[PDB]
Design a protein around this ligand. Structure first.
Ligand SMILES: CC1(C)CC(NC(=O)c2csc3cncn23)C1
Ligand code: NI
Length: 303
């Protein structure tokens, strides 16, 4: 009986954040393989869960409109609005980064002209870690399915809008239980079910809980990366995604075969674990300390 809001349907329940579409394009960020929890439930309107709350987001050329579902219905609070400002990292100027990258990279300049407003979300470490464990040998639509079924089966029910039931991301204890792997295989995760259960268990038992991920957020990149790579199902590529996307390491550059292809084809680059590391160093040396943000532009431009 509760329905997803549109800007038309519910004018009184939207706040706005001044946001040029050069600083953020929702449609190039929210289903571009960073977060797997946003869906365009009606045209130009993106709905998904942030913490214990559902949001719907839409934008004009100059304004980002948001509405939150929790309580009697009301507009987002200043605090809730600050959460969203932090999630999109809107303190950082994307126009200024784009021009700094273009100054040393003509390929980026060409490719970025049509793909403005591609920025990096600042994601919850737990959600990001388990989402990217599920991302091995996978595509966006299937990862999206696995994450949603995982949240339904293990996370707290938040609300229903139209036919969509929203759940919070599970805690580690929920993912670490004795039937968790078997249940996750029923939900279609395959071998990734093992890594989910075992990484939840590892963080709880060997690292002291989720405070450990917050510690990695403040630790230096190389230390964070090394620490993540001790987890089941987390190798260099996945660790770099998490570094970039959840641990505030903007220089982290995830290297897979697709980045090799681009580097070789579009940059003329020529040199395994060692060469993958060398390629990440190449892009840091070229673009600087926000190299992973630059790569996100190219990734989201290639989609
Ligand atoms: C396995 C996937 C479909 C999900 C993964 N996402 C990315 O690799 C990515 C999104 S933005 C960025 C910057 N560097 C890597 N990425 C591909
Ligand atoms: Ni060649």
């Amino acid at each position: 009986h509760m329905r997803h809001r549109t800007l038309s349907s519910s004018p009184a329940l939207w706040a706005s954040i001044p946001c040029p579409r050069s600083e953020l394009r929702l449609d190039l960020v929210l289903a571009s393989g960073q977060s797997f929890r946003w869906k365009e439930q009606s045209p130009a309107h993106w709905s998904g869960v942030l913490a214990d709350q559902v949001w719907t987001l839409t934008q004009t050329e100059d304004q980002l409109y948001c509405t939150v579902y929790r309580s009697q219905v009301s507009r987002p609070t200043l605090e809730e609005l600050e959460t969203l400002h932090k999630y999109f990292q809107l303190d950082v100027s994307l126009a200024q980064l784009y021009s700094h990258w273009a100054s040393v990279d003509s390929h980026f300049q060409r490719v970025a002209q049509k793909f403005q407003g591609v920025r990096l979300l600042r994601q919850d470490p737990t959600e990001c870690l388990f989402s990217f464990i599920c991302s091995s040998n996978n595509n966006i639509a299937r990862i999206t399915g696995m994450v949603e079924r995982l949240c339904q089966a293990f996370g707290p029910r938040l609300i229903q809008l139209d036919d969509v039931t929203y759940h919070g991301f599970p805690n580690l204890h929920a993912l670490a239980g004795p039937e968790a792997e078997t249940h996750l295989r029923k939900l279609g995760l395959g071998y990734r079910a093992r890594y989910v259960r075992a990484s939840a268990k590892a963080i709880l038992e060997e690292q002291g809980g989720p405070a450990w991920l917050q510690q990695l957020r403040v630790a230096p990149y190389e230390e964070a990366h090394k620490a993540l790579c001790t987890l089941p199902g987390v190798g260099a590529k996945v660790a770099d995604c998490i570094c970039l996307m959840a641990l505030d390491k903007p220089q982290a550059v995830p290297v897979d075969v697709h980045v090799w292809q681009i580097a070789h084809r579009d940059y003329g680059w020529h040199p395994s674990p060692l060469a993958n590391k060398e390629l990440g160093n190449f892009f840091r040396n070229l673009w600087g300390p926000y190299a992973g943000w630059a790569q996100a532009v190219l990734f989201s431009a290639d989609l």
